[PDB]
Amino acid sequence: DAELLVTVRGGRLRGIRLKTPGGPVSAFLGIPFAEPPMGPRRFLPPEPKQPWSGVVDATTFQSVCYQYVDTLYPGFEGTEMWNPNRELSEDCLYLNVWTPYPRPTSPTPVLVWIYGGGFYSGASSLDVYDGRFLVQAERTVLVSMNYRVGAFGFLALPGSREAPGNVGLLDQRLALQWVQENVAAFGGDPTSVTLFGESAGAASVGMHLLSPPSRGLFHRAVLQSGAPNGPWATVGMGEARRRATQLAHLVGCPTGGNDTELVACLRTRPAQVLVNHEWHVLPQESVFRFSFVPVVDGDFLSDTPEALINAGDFHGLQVLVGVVKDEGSYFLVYGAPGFSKDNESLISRAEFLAGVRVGVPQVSDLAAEAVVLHYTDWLHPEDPARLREALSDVVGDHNVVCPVAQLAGRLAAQGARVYAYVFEHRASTLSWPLWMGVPHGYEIEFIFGIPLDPSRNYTAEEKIFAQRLMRYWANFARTGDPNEPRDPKAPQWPPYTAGAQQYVSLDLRPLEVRRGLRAQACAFWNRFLPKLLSAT
Amino acid sequence: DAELLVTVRGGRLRGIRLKTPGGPVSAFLGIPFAEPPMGPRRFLPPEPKQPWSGVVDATTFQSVCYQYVDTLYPGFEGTEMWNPNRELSEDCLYLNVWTPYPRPTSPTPVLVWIYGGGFYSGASSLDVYDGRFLVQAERTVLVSMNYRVGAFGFLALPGSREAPGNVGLLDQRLALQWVQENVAAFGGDPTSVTLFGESAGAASVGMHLLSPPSRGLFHRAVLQSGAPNGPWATVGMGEARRRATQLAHLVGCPGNDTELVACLRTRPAQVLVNHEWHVLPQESVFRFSFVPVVDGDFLSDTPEALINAGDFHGLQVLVGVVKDEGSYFLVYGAPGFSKDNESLISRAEFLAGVRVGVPQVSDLAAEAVVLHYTDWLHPEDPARLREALSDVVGDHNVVCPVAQLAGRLAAQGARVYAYVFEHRASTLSWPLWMGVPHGYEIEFIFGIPLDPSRNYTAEEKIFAQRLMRYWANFARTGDPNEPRDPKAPQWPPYTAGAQQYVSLDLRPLEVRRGLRAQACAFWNRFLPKLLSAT
Ligand SMILES: *[C@@H]1O[C@H](CO[C@@H]2O[C@@H](C)[C@@H](O)[C@@H](O)[C@@H]2O)[C@@H](O[C@@H]2O[C@H](CO)[C@@H](O[C@@H]3O[C@H](CO)[C@@H](O)[C@H](O)[C@@H]3O)[C@H](O)[C@H]2NC(C)=O)[C@H](O)[C@H]1NC(C)=O
């Protein structure tokens, strides 16, 4: 094979041909786009991989960045699927490129995937991120990169040169710059790069929108179940320092200044040491909160994500946003009182009232009473089934849905063309219980065409459903519109607007246009709630 | 007729035999129960009527207490029906007694009606308060009273012995004492007195529940579209004094309190009426200048506090509301509202109407009201904004104060029955966007449909006859669903948990749950916590 040998600016790669039931795909896995961020480079921004000699073995995924492996439910596919499938290493800044086996003679749009793991986990090597089907079915170019998570990518001592923070986002930006310079060698169009990511990956995508230096690296953006303005995606410079300085004490860290000496001590500790003390850094007991996330230091983000969203012009931009039907149901079993995968999680009102403070941390008691007011059925205020689904909405609306709805309504009203969805599909018998519905991150495998894998046991209707979803994403990446242009008979997906608030439902049934993305609930979170903290 | 001459402790009376389609009824109208509160007695507690020589003419209604006359819709039946239909005079402390024509042999339950006109208006002489069909179809003594309204009945200079306030409620109390000593002369049972009133009259009934001296003057209570814990039914002694002095400065009037009241007595009655509404702090709706005051005498504490810990075990109470409590009020102040046009307000007029429907609250508080009551899928829809503001005024002032009262009486041992009147009268002159507006169930409670002069509907006539039996079954037994009918649905008591009420309309009884539970949780629970923390 000669199509499996490509010469990028840094050197030569030896790719591998992947077998899809519809045809072959040329893959280049484990391409270094940065020098190994080890030793003095830990906590520092990445710098480009210098030109190498020989041919880089690009036939398998490289190492997973050091992260906390969740040991909640061992041997359970619903949680094991997100754990690292490669060895952990600080030498992890590698990217992957899928391209059609007949290398495209004409430049095709490029889809760049940014994985989400709450900014503390994740890897581009996970099986649900395999881009062989999305490429073979729609003849596009799929790129996915690893970026430093946890303290290795987002520990910030704001101001200091040795730990500026947001270096995990700079890993992504450097990978995007690598695409602009080298994706043409694989048949991709650098002027037609579409970002798409889920959860923290969607928040990352949203931050490249609000970061001027990154805006010139991509054309369109897709945010799946995540937004940069979420209550979990950023921290202030004060909290970032209080969290970094605490981690140094947990690991025993007393012309170097005190910040320079703090980082120098943190760089002596083995990577696994810093991981074991990560979750001990969070202020209080909480759910859907993470220790080291992007920081509003000023460099990467001129202001908070909310401030950049409001006072921003987004003309000439197409954005695709969406959420799953049951966002917060997963995060309840992890930390909420009385919740479990195995016992139906019927909760009392005392457990509900306690779960509100865990799901909505660092708010006044008056604010918590406002949350209890809206999410209580005061005719049946102690029904365990209603209380279980109410707290699932509390975490879902507060963390994902309403940040997404706030972003979409703002982008659509300030120049952008926005399309919105709600993934409502759930298998007949899923590994998770029924009360959790369509949980966080369940749309990824269908978007990536995983049902087309012959080794998996998906319904033949689910394979058709996946191919339709791949068409929507490819059509958006190609034209900025998920609809088929030469097909006025197909169910129309109208753009989301701040007034009509139209979105479609994604399931086995044809597209159904719905109105209002939790409009009544998100008016509380996005409008009334913030004015409560200021007044009280 | 020998059934028309009755003697009370004050003296002899001479009644009139009123005629109903079902039979005759003996009536005694304009019975003086207090000395005329004129001159120096203005703003003072009522003095008992001293006995008289001869026979008092009790064949016609007496004068209406001086009050504001609604002139914004001249000639309109919907508003004129509440305007005073007799001569205005400060000599108005009179009551009316209706009794079945063959005076009952055994003691009979007594119904005592307290009219409600926001404490600024009303009269027992109105046509809808005509107690002849209720007294004939159920044979229960009906007594109605006139109490001082406006400044003459509720102007309060706290601490002053010249204007202690609540003298209009003391007018009602003195009438109840008159019932306790004289209703037996008409065949009534003093030990089985049931109070019932609407609006300010319902609030007045609730305040007699919360005032220990009145608890010995009645046995059961009915509160229709009103409650003493409403945001409009009481004021503090500080606000009562600022409104009292403000009225003095607007009429040109200067201990310093004694000379202030003396000057107000010199002013003509109509002069005070002309300046009553001007003493209100902000432009508002469903707000009245002179209401009962929390002075420590009549109301030892605020009504909401007297409800939490009170003597309520064994007390039979009947409460209820209409389907559209706040629609009627919006034509008196709300921007963009009129009975002539559909009142399809814009959002700018909706937000402005919230500040006039919910006055005297902070900016943050008003935004909480903009939430909940805004359909954020159609926040610009004028038909929704109009119907939403109707809920805001109805819930904040009537529905939720009633739900709070009913739930807390039941939790302390009271047998509470709740209803929702939702039949729009066919003879109703108000527009259709008002639905079943405030105060339009009194016609059916008093059996006004039975009047052959009125052109009511055939099935509205049996509907009224059914409501009269419900109210009568409450006065006699304390249980409206007294008929042991397995063919007719039962009326379950209202409890704090189940929160069951019945709907009143042409259709038979429908038992529902939740008297605006999601909305009243905001008004009765969250909003107070928001005001004390802002
Ligand atoms: C519904 O009707 C109301 C009531 O207005 C009166 O009755 C109507 C049937 C017509 O005969 C009107 O000419 C009549 O005034 C109207 O509501 C509007 O309320 C606003 C308050 O926001 C007032 O507007 C201002 O008021 C004065 C007095 O006219 C002027 O100085 C100003 O120019 C301004 O109009 C006003 O009372 C009234 N509108 C007008 C035009 O006077 C309104 O017409 C209508 N409202 C709806 C459908 O929302």
Ligand SMILES: CC(=O)N[C@H]1[C@H]([C@@H](O)[C@@H](O)CO)O[C@@](O[C@H]2[C@H](O)[C@@H](O[C@@H]3[C@H](O)[C@H](NC(C)=O)[C@@H](O)O[C@H]3CO)O[C@@H](CO)[C@H]2O)(C(=O)O)C[C@@H]1O
């Ligand atoms: C501000 C006011 O002055 N405070 C008093 C007030 C009372 O003065 C008004 O009722 C006067 O109209 O309210 C209280 O009223 C009680 C009244 O003093 C007491 O006395 C009754 C009543 O006098 C009755 N009338 C007869 C015809 O003369 C007489 O029989 O004697 C007494 C009953 O045996 O009775 C109480 C119960 O009815 C009240 O009416 C009320 O306590 O607030 C007293 C206030 O001091």
Ligand SMILES: *[C@@H]1O[C@H](CO[C@@H]2O[C@@H](C)[C@@H](O)[C@@H](O)[C@@H]2O)[C@@H](O[C@@H]2O[C@H](CO)[C@@H](O)[C@H](O)[C@H]2NC(C)=O)[C@H](O)[C@H]1NC(C)=O
């Ligand atoms: C449902 O389960 C939760 C979670 O508890 C875990 O899973 C249970 C099935 C059982 O194996 C527990 O021991 C596990 O810790 C239960 O909530 C916990 O209850 C236990 C028992 O004392 C205790 O550790 C904590 O108070 C609870 N902890 C948390 C995090 O919720 C819950 O009681 C179960 N609910 C029902 C209705 O059975």
Ligand SMILES: O/N=C\c1nc(CCCCNc2ccnc3ccccc23)ccc1O
């Ligand atoms: O497997 N049987 C069912 C199943 N359930 C899911 C959702 C459950 C996990 C919730 N979501 C995440 C947890 C941890 N890490 C993540 C990282 C990226 C995206 C999502 C997550 C997804 C695919 C599946 O097939």
Ligand SMILES: [Cl-]
């Ligand atoms: Cl398992």
Ligand SMILES: [Cl-]
């Ligand atoms: Cl998997």
Ligand SMILES: [Cl-]
């Ligand atoms: Cl996660």
Ligand SMILES: [Cl-]
């Ligand atoms: Cl912060």
Ligand SMILES: [Cl-]
């Ligand atoms: Cl801070």
Ligand SMILES: [Cl-]
């Ligand atoms: Cl901390």
Ligand SMILES: [Cl-]
């Ligand atoms: Cl913690």
Ligand SMILES: [Cl-]
């Ligand atoms: Cl988590």
Ligand SMILES: [Cl-]
């Ligand atoms: Cl949803």
Ligand SMILES: [Cl-]
């Ligand atoms: Cl948000």
Ligand SMILES: [Cl-]
């Ligand atoms: Cl456009």
Ligand SMILES: [Cl-]
């Ligand atoms: Cl078409």
Ligand SMILES: [Cl-]
């Ligand atoms: Cl067509």
